[PDB]
């Protein structure tokens, strides 16, 4: 099955709460199948801007891909890594469209051909940095919507962070678990205090407390604490995965985002490393169309090591370019029974 055509466009998705941009990718085969992909580059984490992403997705720059056989997909992905080495979000949009196509070609949901390890998982929704009152309010809104897991961003100001966490813990009254994301904002003593609190409050783990290039700060922690820490901005691709997993392992949880690693194929390499090293998998996202969320979910549901999801990147989108691909019920995400990514597109 030959790739007949590749088209990219910019989409402006207003937020329900401001807008956010995604590159939308259509790959068509000669028999008329359509694979779908979406790119949401994060320049501060990967260096990849929207301009560079868009440029790497140019139809003519992608000429090497035209006419190629999708049945060769792992070779294709190896070429995506070689020919778009600086544009991981673009790479992911193409990679996910190609997997969509291969799964449609085999007539099954993608997770089925990746091989299924899980039926569904709870996803977190995010409460950003704000005061106690707004935090508790959001918490109750989410609880009402059926969510059992909250992800709270922390700013690194301890009195405030800790207060928000205590009050949130009291309000929730065991109705949902909490996980936190300081995103690089903590120092070493501060992290020790935060971890004491986290133990106290039953918070599940701490994501990326330290600067991305600070992994030595992580390794200097007691193993019991490292096990409770997730790598996000420190983990882009398989190379990072291997360096972090190598004894002494820097942490106990890997946060994989397609827009960091560059697609499902590199994601499988990370999963291989994590699983051998006994590291749990978290699957996150940028602000994303339901297309790439769906892709991420198929991959996650196909990894035995997957323990957690922050998959909420399409929830704040006022409009999207596709429906389906995943079903949300009672705070849990699962895929549908349709082939490929299982997206409905006009």
Region of 17-25, 125-133, 192-200, 206-214 interacting with Mg ion (CB under 5 A): 206-214
What sign does the CA torsion over 178, 183, 188, 190 have? negative
Q: What is the CA radius of gyration of the chain?
A: 20
Q: Which stretch binds Mg ion (CB under 5 A): 9-17, 126-134, 144-152, 228-236?
A: 228-236
Q: Using CA atoms, how far apart are residues 66 and 10, in angstroms rounded to an integer?
A: 21
Residue 178: enclosing H or E segment and its boundaries? Answer: strand 177-181
Residue 30 makes contact with a second copy by CB under 8 A: no
Order of strands across the sheet with 327-329? 121-122, 332-334, 327-329
Q: Which stretch binds a second copy (CB under 8 A): 132-140, 188-196, 218-226, 268-276?
A: 268-276
Is there a binding annotation on residue 16? no
Sheet holding 125-127, edge to edge: 125-127, 149-153, 177-181, 206-207, 229-231, 253-256, 280-283, 306-309
Quick check: 77 binds a second copy (CB under 8 A)? Answer: yes
Q: Residue 216, annotated ligand binder?
A: no
117 binding a second copy? (CB under 8 A): yes
Residue 232 assigned to a binding site? yes
Nearer residue to Mg ion within complex by CB, 109 or 313: 313
Cα(244)–Cα(116) distance, integer angstroms: 26
Q: Which two tokens stand for residue 137?
A: 């309010």
Residue 186: strand, helix, or coil: coil
Under rule CB under 8 A, residue 85 binds a second copy: no
Rank residues 31 and 69 by Cβ distance to a second copy and give the closer one: 69
Residue 207 binds Mg ion (CB under 5 A): yes
Choosing among Mg ion, a second copy, none, which partner's interface includes residue 238 (Cβ < 5 to 8 Å by kind)? a second copy
Of Mg ion, a second copy, none, which one does residue 273 interact with (CB within 5 to 8 Å by kind)?
a second copy
Tokens of 281: 């998998």
232 contributes a contact to Mg ion by CB under 5 A = yes
Nearer to a second copy, 26 or 112 (CB): 112
Q: With respect to Mg ion, which residue has the nearer C-beta, 236 or 321?
A: 236
Q: Would you state the structure tokens that stand for residue 116, as one six-digit string?
A: 């299924």
151 annotated among ligand-binding-site residues? yes
Q: If 0-12 CB within 10 Å is exposed, 13-18 middle and 19+ buried, where does residue 8 land?
A: buried
Q: How many CB atoms lie within 10 A of CB 202?
A: 11
Query: Looking only at residues 126 through 185 of this chain, which bind Mg ion when binding is defined by CB under 5 A?
Result: 181
- The answer to whether residue 252 forms part of the interface with a second copy (CB under 8 A) is no
Closest to a second copy by CB, 90 or 241: 241
Rounded to the nearest 5°, which phi and psi values hold at 22? -130, 145
Region from 42-50, 101-109, 220-228, 319-327 binding a second copy, contact rule CB under 8 A: 101-109
Q: Binding site membership for Mg(2+): which residues?
A: 181, 207, 232
Interacting residue ranges for a second copy, rule: CB under 8 A: 69, 71-78, 105-108, 112-117, 238-239, 241-242, 245-247, 269, 272-273, 276-277, 302, 304
């Amino acid at each position: 099955m030959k790739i007949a055509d590749i088209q990219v466009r910019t989409e402006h998705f207003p937020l329900t709460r401001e807008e956010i941009d995604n590159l939308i990718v259509e790959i068509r085969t000669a028999d008329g199948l359509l694979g779908l992909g979406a790119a949401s580059p994060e320049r501060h984490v990967t260096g990849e801007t929207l301009e560079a992403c868009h440029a790497a997705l140019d139809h003519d720059r992608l000429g090497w891909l035209m006419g190629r056989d999708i049945r060769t997909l792992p070779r294709l992905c190896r070429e995506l890594a070689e020919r778009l080495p600086a544009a991981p979000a673009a790479r992911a949009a193409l990679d996910m469209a190609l997997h969509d196509l291969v799964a449609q070609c085999l007539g099954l949901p993608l997770v089925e051909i990746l091989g299924r390890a899980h039926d569904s998982l709870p996803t977190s929704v995010t409460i950003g940095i704000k005061p106690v009152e707004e935090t508790l309010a959001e918490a109750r809104e989410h609880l009402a919507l059926g969510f059992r897991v909250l992800k709270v961003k922390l700013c690194g100001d301890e009195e405030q962070d800790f207060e928000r966490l205590r009050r949130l813990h009291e309000t929730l009254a065991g109705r949902a678990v909490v996980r936190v994301d300081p995103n690089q904002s903590y120092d070493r003593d501060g992290l020790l205090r935060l971890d004491r609190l986290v133990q106290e409050l039953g918070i599940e783990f701490i994501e990326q407390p330290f600067p991305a290039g600070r992994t030595d700060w992580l390794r200097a922690l007691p193993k019991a604490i490292r096990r409770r820490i997730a790598a996000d901005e420190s983990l882009l691709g398989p190379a990072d995965a291997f360096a972090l997993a190598a004894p002494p392992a820097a942490c106990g949880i890997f946060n994989i985002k397609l827009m960091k690693c560059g697609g499902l194929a590199p994601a499988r390499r990370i999963a291989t490393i994590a699983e051998t090293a006994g590291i749990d998998l978290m699957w996150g996202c940028m602000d994303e169309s339901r297309i790439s969320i769906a892709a991420a979910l198929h991959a996650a549901l196909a990894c035995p090591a997957t323990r957690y999801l922050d998959l909420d990147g399409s929830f704040d989108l006022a409009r999207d370019v596709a429906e389906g691909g995943f079903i949300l019920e009672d705070g849990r995400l699962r895929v549908t029974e349709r082939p490929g990514l299982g997206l409905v597109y006009p």
